[PDB]
Design a protein around this nucleic acid. Sequence first.
RNA 1: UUCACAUUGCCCAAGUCUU
RNA 2: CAAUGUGA
Length: 799
Amino acid sequence: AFKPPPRPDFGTSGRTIKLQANFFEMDIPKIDIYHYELDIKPEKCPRRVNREIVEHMVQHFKTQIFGKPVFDGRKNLYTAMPLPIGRDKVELEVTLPIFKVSIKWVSCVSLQALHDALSGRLPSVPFETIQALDVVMRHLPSMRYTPVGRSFFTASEGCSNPLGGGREVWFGFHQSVRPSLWKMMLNIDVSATAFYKAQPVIEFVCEVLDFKSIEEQQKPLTDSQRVKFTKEIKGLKVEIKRKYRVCNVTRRPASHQTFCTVAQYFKDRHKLVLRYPHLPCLQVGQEQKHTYLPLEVCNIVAGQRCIKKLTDNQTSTMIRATARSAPDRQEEISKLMRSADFNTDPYVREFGIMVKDEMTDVTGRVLQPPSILYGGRNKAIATPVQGVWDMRNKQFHTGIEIKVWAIACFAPQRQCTEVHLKSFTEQLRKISRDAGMPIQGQPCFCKYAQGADSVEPMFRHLKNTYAGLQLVVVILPGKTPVYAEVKRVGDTVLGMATQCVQMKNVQRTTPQTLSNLCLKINVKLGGVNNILLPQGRPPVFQQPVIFLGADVTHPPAGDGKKPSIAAVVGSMDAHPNRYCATVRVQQHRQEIIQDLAAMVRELLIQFYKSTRFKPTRIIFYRDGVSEGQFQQVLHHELLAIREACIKLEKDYQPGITFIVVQKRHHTRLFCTDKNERVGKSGNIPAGTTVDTKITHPTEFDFYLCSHAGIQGTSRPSHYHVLWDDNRFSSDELQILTYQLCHTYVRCTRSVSIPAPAYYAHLVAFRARYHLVDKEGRDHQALAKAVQVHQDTLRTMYFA
RNA sequence: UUCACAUUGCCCAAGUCUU
RNA sequence: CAAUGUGA
Ligand SMILES: [Mg+2]
Ligand SMILES: [Mg+2]
Ligand SMILES: [Mg+2]
């Protein structure tokens, strides 16, 4: 239940392709380095303050200690050669513009043992060793640049990327030390994030309040101006030599604001006559004291990342400033590494480390896509080309016959007229007839409505009046709270199928849009759009098997009380195509799925009810777990799956395959040959697979870019097998995973992650919609909100 | 709320110390 | 999913 399986073999399927990865080979010396535990009293200091302390400490004691050590900003210091210490704590006293620093040797870290672990010699990779190398590579940039996670950001020289609102774009790069089949690798990728400009607060006001210049005007701000400004600068730090954090903007101008007025105080003591006394002051420091700074004598301090959400316009600017095709990104990574010059870094060089300046070459394989079987009389077979196919002259494998349906238009009648609805209905019936999902009649019901209050009574009337009602098509004017209400009533209250459509897609229809629309409708009504060509599937389908997709979605940044949402879906046929969903609310920002055992039990029960088979195997696709959570998550969740089986029957012990899916990492793959690049974005082809060189030295993992890259640089999904009772070969599991990317019903394309994992996202996001403005007695309220109706339980409402 | 892809938002990481 | 783009 605890240790991941070794790599069974290497894949052999598919034609080869020359790739370049943003991994850079590291040459590590085979010598012991020396680990020391520090202490710094007081120890509530920010991490960067601790780096200053040790930095000054190193030189302020250079003489009979420290004859170029590295430091993690907390508690760990490393040297390439040993110090004079013994094992003794050597408390030092250091002063920086009153600190006690204790230095104690702890262990010897052998880089020799790392070479063995990267080889077949040692069974596993020693974390503490890679942890040390990480501190070596991060030492310099952690003081030179502004750390954000595993990245480093800085104001770009000579350029300025303003966002407005006192914000601008800082470019940066991600850095991480990784073991691999070949060598140690330095993974480098470029990135960009928003920062507040280091400008006078006076000019910060102008951008926030949209003033061309101050003295526009010379009257104290309106309360509406003062409230907007207070929201932006509160929590931000400002400087004079001495730095404060802003907690409040005073109501009264500096001329009147008394504590002795602020204006007066600065006239006598500091001999400063304020140029804009009519403006308020910044209350800084402790909220329960009376320290007020005029705007004129304050600057926003540099290197403060913008945590708040960007505006629509700010986002739009951010996108344009950082959007890059795959070759363009490739060159920006390359240019960065040449200019980075990691080998002159004195700390990197103290530890005798060398970093390759060229991207690593890696050979991938482009897997063949599966054939997609359709229905109708002809039973057409689609052949994905470059990750895409279409439904033209093809009918659904199992198309639904729609006899009873209705339209509910919440768009204004002037904007969405009966003629519009009629034409839309005309075209939709045409497309749906072609697709093998005939809408036999005009809707038995069609009424306009307004507001969220009209939803439930209308839907209740519909359910009571029209027997055999299959669907309600809901027209929406755009972004409106009605949508969430439609889904609350439909999914959870009354248990009725609904398909919403934006007004603009009714006024002006297209064959493609209407086609995609039918894909959702047919699925929602129990249909089967298409299936994998049966004889083209991997051998695993010879026995009953269920495919589980699982994901947790956490609240946005800055949020503190909203629940995390766990969603799990399971296949309900042998194709596989039909899926049922389970969903739960759980603790804030907890990744481990707490109630998984219960959820899997439901899915296993519903699988048997649907197929009359008991799975002999369980394939578990787990999205979004990082390497630092593999053991924790696997321990709880693998056992939870077993628990579900055991509490059901026997002696029922199906083989479990546990696979972690990671779409969001920092590995990027590029075509070496320009003639391999695909489309305008110039990305690697769909099906590109990498399970060598850059992958894990001992464990079963691979990259699979299963989708066509439309824009930017494609994210190759990474798959890591944490458990496998079924003993998959690399070829079978990679093909299986790839084929499951072709079973996503909402489009005739290969998607970036397997359908079950994708559905899990959709289910989680739907639950989040049921919880809008609603997020023991607390838990049960939220739990009921995400609980769907009895009639919705076995449906694909999430489509 | 036709859909995918891409950027950010999500576990780990990161962050958090005389007017 | 939301914002913003590229696309069908
Ligand atoms: Mg997740
Ligand atoms: Mg943490
Ligand atoms: Mg969007």
